[PDB]
Amino acid sequence: KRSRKESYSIYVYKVLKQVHPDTGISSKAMGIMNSFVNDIFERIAGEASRLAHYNKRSTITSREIQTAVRLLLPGELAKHAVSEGTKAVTKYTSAK
Amino acid sequence: KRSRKESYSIYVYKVLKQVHPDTGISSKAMGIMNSFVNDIFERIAGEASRLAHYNKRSTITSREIQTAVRLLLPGELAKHAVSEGTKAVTKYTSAK
Amino acid sequence: KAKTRSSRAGLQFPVGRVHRLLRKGNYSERVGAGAPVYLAAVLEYLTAEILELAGNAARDNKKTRIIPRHLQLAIRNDEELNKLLGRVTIAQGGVLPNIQAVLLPK
Amino acid sequence: TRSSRAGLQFPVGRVHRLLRKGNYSERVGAGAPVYLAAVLEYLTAEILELAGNAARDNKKTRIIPRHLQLAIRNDEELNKLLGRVTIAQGGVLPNIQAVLLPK
Amino acid sequence: KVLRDNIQGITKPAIRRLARRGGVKRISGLIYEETRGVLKVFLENVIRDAVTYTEHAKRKTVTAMDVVYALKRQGRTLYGFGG
Amino acid sequence: RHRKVLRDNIQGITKPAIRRLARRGGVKRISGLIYEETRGVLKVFLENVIRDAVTYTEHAKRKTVTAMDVVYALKRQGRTLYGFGG
Amino acid sequence: PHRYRPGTVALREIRRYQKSTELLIRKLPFQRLVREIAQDFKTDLRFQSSAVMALQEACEAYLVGLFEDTNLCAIHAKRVTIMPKDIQLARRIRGERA
Amino acid sequence: PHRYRPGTVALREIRRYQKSTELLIRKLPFQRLVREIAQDFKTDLRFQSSAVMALQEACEAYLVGLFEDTNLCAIHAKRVTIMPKDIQLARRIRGERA
DNA sequence: GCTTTTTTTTTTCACAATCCCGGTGCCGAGGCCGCTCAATTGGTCGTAGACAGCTCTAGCACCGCTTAAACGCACGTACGGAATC
Ligand SMILES: [Ca+2]
Ligand SMILES: [Ca+2]
Ligand SMILES: [Cl-]
Ligand SMILES: [Cl-]
Ligand SMILES: [K+]
């Protein structure tokens, strides 16, 4: 078999069908969506790495994630992102 | 007491007395030289970090540094920069 | 037994996969157990937000599946997304219909 | 000492520690921080040699931010490396667009 | 008057002096407000990030580093304050 | 190895094609002197982008420039490109 | 004999190409040009086809957008014909060029 | 009654300021701006002295740089006097405002 | 204030270009399958960092002098830009 090449494509479909059920996605489109998630992974994870480093901290926490999102995302985009991480962590925490 | 914050200054001074043994330097000037060294150290290490990362390698070696330097410094400066990093390693290897 | 972290967080995006990539990505020595949840959260939000707008431009173009152009129109016509993807180039994307005023006929 | 072994003033020890710690890679070769010290040392020297000239050309013994700015902005290659960098108290290169000068 | 729009504290004389150091000769009147606009957006952007740093570090005192780190993010890397 | 040395392919970037790119940029009227000037610019873009890709190749010891080589090179020039991996 | 007024077809072309996304340089001429330039830096190199396509996507985009900047620069000096000096200003303010 | 013609002090003032390195904005007014603007993001903030000077080096630097680019646009429109539309164009081309 | 043309506006068809549909056909989006290797479970151990307590740094407030800089106003020259060619 060809060597295993991971992607976010199954997650992208799963999200797409939540938003626009009647809607599909071309090979190339999905590849752009992939560049996008990797792009923003690198940026958020990078500014997290920094925040921790700056504060003489060995650990990226969800705190560092949040703050980096405040630095990296424009206005209303950042807010919804801050709420939706804050939801998800809370839900995860009570579920243990 | 009073913190204990490291800096490249004692070395900036040592190099200065190699290139100009009678000229001195202000604290604002030495602050720019310390800003300069830290800047490029982070530039070359980050580009090495990524090189290594793109080639599924765990070790930054002197080779990663030399590829990062071709990438970061402009032609004629990269040339001397390699020439000096090569020569320093050769000399270091030679000693023990 | 066996319930994925992503399910416990109400998430589609993989917390398992994310919490690895942080550790292996030379970002820091340690990783808190919320960090990869939070991050998967944000990547899912942002991903959803682009597919919400892409798909409208998909529909408005009278087609069922999203292609590069839909994404581009959706990114460039949306004020904030365009800022976030300001130094980013979308392949087979093209440009927004824009013709400067003074170039038009009298 | 290591720096002494490598022909260097810059500290091959210190540099090596900043790499392991500084979240660049899992492991660090024994070459890298030698090489990296050498390159930082090289670049340091070129600026100081050029800015130490700017001081003496202004009959002054101590190098100041202006001397660095002048050294750096007049050296096609150093300018490009530090093209998106601001030097506090550097000032700017005397230069007046031609069509503004009289006649 | 003389009241709490500190942006106006940025005098025409000082705006003139910048554009001098920037090789400008003849300065339209409308410009000193345009400049004032532009300066604020500049500070807003940098200071928002610098204080975002401050709040993360759990402090009430904005450090010179916080600014340095902000200016790097904005692509305006500054030498000689802790780089 | 079975013939590969290259010609003068910069004139391959025809006046028609430069005109079409200007058109996409919403340009209505184009001077005589644009087309040569454009090729200079284009060349200097490509020289810079390929030098860097070619580096990333030579490091991984390959003799084949990958799309990722070009991608990694483009992100380096602050020209991040979406839809060819990474 | 019917004849369209100078600008009326340019304006059509402008709308034709803004609507579309296909690449505007002839794919082989461009490919030959990639290969020619790459020799400077290393000989007997193979390119993935995706690497060459990734380069023509990144090129066309860079120029198409420079031509925007360049058009504003023409219009700024109350002109409609983009001229060499227009590009050069665009690039000098971008900082691509000393 | 000695009277220098328009623009002839300008040039003196250019030569003068380009030779020098000293902040051109008055330090206290600047500082009062930095606190005014800081409030809008957090109350009862204190600043290191050097934080404000880091902010003021950075500001003037940007402004000076923007004026160079502005001058260039104004000269590009066969003019000698900078105007807002020069600033706005140089910012449009810097990718600072859309 | 006219008489006589140019300038600008209007209306009438001719023609090209683009637009919108159904028909047709090919191929890649979508999805199912079977197997894998990476995410999960449940465990252990060590230390990173939260936390309370104390030190003293440097940020802030205030005040009272001495200017240097900002200010406002008079005046006119060189500039921007409209108009023509
Ligand atoms: Ca919906
Ligand atoms: Ca189907
Ligand atoms: Cl966490
Ligand atoms: Cl090594
Ligand atoms: K890192």
Residue numbers in the entry:
A (entry chain N), B (entry chain R): 30 to 125
C (entry chain M): 13 to 118
D (entry chain Q): 16 to 118
E (entry chain L): 20 to 102
F (entry chain P): 17 to 102
G (entry chain O), H (entry chain K): 38 to 135
Text taken from the publication that reported this structure:
The eukaryotic genome is packaged into chromatin by an approximately equal mass of histone proteins, which provide a foundation for modulating gene expression, maintaining genomic stability and regulating DNA transactions in general. Histone octamers composed of H2A, H2B, H3 and H4 core histones assemble variable expanses of ∼160–240 DNA base pairs (bp) into nucleosomes, the repeating units of chromatin. Here we show that nucleosomal constructs with cohesive-ended DNA can be designed that assemble into different types of circular configurations or continuous fibers extending throughout crystals. By introducing DNA annealing as a site-specific and directional driving force, cohesive-ended nucleosomes can promote self-assembly into well-ordered lattices with a variety of possible configurations.
